[PDB]
Amino acid sequence: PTYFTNFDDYNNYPSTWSNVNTTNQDGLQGSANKLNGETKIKIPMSELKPYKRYVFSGYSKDPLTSNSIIVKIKAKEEKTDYLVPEQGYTKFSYEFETTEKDSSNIEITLIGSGTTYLDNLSITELN
């Protein structure tokens, strides 16, 4: 994993995730990001490799199982996805790609209904 956060002691992301609420003990381990609304990150292309395929992964859950999440990734393409959390934590994965090492950013957005929980968000290189 290139970038990782556990919403506890570890976060090596080069930019901040917005709207992070970790005052809970509902994580896969420790604390989770309790998502109410949107959490977004802009990662400069200076902090990523060019012409690379990546996977944005993580774990989500909704104990009341009545909510869903839109994942939007703005990279080479601008693709949106539909994520339905289960009652307990399960892993999600979404591929995206980079092009040139310009001064643009790739953008990762998670937008949920109600209250959902996110933990151990990673960005990993593939090929």
Binding residues for Ca(2+): 6, 8, 29, 31, 119
Site string for Ca ion, 60-99 (x = CB under 5 A): ----------------------------------------
Q: Does 6 bind Ca ion (CB under 5 A)?
A: yes
- What's the rounded Cα separation, in Å, for the pair 34 and 95? 24
Contact segment (CB under 5 A) with Ca ion among 48-56, 73-81, 90-98, 116-124 equals: 116-124
- What's the rounded Cα separation, in Å, for the pair 121 and 92? 10
Q: Does 58 bind Ca ion (CB under 5 A)?
A: no
Please identify which residue in 3, 5, 7, 85 interacts with Ca ion, judged by CB under 5 A: 7
Q: Cβ atoms within 10 A of the Cβ of 90, count?
A: 12
Least Å from the CB of residue 10 to Ca ion: 9
Q: Going by C-beta distance under 8 Å and a sequence separation of 6 or more, which residues neighbour residue 60?
A: 69, 83, 85, 89, 90, 92, 116, 117, 118, 119
**Interface ranges with Ca ion (CB under 5 A):** 6-8, 27, 30, 119
